[PDB]
Design a protein around this ligand. Sequence first.
Ligand SMILES: Cc1cc2c(cc1C)N(C[C@H](O)[C@H](O)[C@H](O)COP(=O)(O)OP(=O)(O)OC[C@H]1O[C@@H](n3cnc4c(N)ncnc43)[C@H](O)[C@@H]1O)c1[nH]c(=O)[nH]c(=O)c1N2
Ligand SMILES: CC(C)=CCC/C(C)=C/CC/C(C)=C/CC/C(C)=C/COP(=O)(O)OP(=O)(O)O
Length: 452
Amino acid sequence: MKELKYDVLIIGGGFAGSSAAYQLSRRGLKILLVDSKPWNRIGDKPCGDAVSKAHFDKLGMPYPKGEELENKINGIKLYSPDMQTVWTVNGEGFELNAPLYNQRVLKEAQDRGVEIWDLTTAMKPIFEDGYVKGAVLFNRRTNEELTVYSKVVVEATGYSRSFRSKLPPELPITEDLDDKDADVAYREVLLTKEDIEDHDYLRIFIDQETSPGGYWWYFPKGKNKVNVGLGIQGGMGYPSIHEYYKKYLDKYAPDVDKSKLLVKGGALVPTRRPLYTMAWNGIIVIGDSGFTVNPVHGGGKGSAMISGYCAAKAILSAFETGDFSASGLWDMNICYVNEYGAKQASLDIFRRFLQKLSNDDINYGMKKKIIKEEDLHEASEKGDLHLSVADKAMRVISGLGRPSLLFKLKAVAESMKKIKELYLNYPRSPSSLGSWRREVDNVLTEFNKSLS
Ligand SMILES: Cc1cc2c(cc1C)N(C[C@H](O)[C@H](O)[C@H](O)COP(=O)(O)OP(=O)(O)OC[C@H]1O[C@@H](n3cnc4c(N)ncnc43)[C@H](O)[C@@H]1O)c1[nH]c(=O)[nH]c(=O)c1N2
Ligand SMILES: CC(C)=CCC/C(C)=C/CC/C(C)=C/CC/C(C)=C/COP(=O)(O)OP(=O)(O)O
């Protein structure tokens, strides 16, 4: 078959892949990005389509404008299980037309020298001499089966992790996902009968009975259009998520016009710390494939762009040292862990705590205000549950006279702090990875026991 040579092959054109291509463009490298979907459908994976504005600023990512921005967001309303307590968290964000913005990032990258092949699937990994050296591609637009050699492969295939799962299991880059370390999520976009009240605010409903292990949401895409859905924890033996959706939709969205359904669908959502290493010999993994999703609120589009940024930086470093080993690409880990990874690890622990709380716990915690918005902002943005904040919450929890998991909040905060420092001390070289990973596992397995 025909053979082509590129500096970098990016597999997947989602938020992760497109950002990597964008950040790498116009810097002396010959880059190819491929995606199985047609151009017009790239980026249309079921999503809430809510992304913080801060991510676009930090990474120098172009703001979503025109038809790419459906609704401006100025905050989030958080509802208690009994709907009695409502927390308001202010902050600027965007409700996106995800495919439209995704395709512009691709189009701009293409205008900057990046070659993009749609309707192209990476079938077989080229793994020779202990290295990832490219992939076999099938372009069904031209019915060609091409062999493409690259110095670095950027695996950005989303939750399917379809490419790296075909690599030898001895590679640390083939680390798989535990069922309980993920959520299944489902959403629909419908027009509403009445205009949406406070349509510039997202709505999140916490309820372990209507959405166990996750939450319900109501994300306005306009004055009369809303992205409504839910997420539940996988590996728990829960019935189909659509059973939950169909049963409790009217409670969280009584205003929707069910005859005006625009889109519907669901997918898997990783909810844990990222891959212990997101780089190895000749390969970097980003996005959902590298588990870059926020373990608490399930947001992954912002951190996917971050992973693409770090992938670009690491690859440039590799070419400047002529070293495409794990060691040569190791800055990928250092960059991402400091930018978002260390936060994920802390929130990974906090998630396990939150998912085991009862509705009574959450009702009590919110009504009695165990934490304030100043620290809630600090919590899900820096991953830090300050010990002073936990102490203040524990003094309130001490007023509870019934048995509750809430009483372990101080211990949870200490565990979050411990694993946070452990990730900030990420191994400088691949030779220290195994020792560090086992130390992380010990912290996690210990914490799981402490919740019982
Ligand atoms: C229902 C629901 C709701 C939400 C969310 C998820 C879900 C399922 N998330 C998470 C968010 O959707 C997700 O984390 C990111 O879109 C991940 O971006 P990626 O580019 O990694 O994956 P993504 O799946 O978007 O990209 C993968 C791409 O690779 C392609 N591909 C796969 N295998 C291939 C192969 N072998 N060859 C070629 N191409 C291949 C696919 O075709 C696809 O285009 C979210 N996030 C957030 O921040 N805000 C929110 O509101 C939500 N809400
Ligand atoms: C539904 C699933 C699976 C995930 C959703 C993920 C979420 C909640 C995304 C919300 C993103 C968004 C639009 C946030 C806007 C509201 C907000 C509190 C933003 C905070 O970000 P910053 O702008 O940095 O906050 P500051 O106000 O401190 O600057």
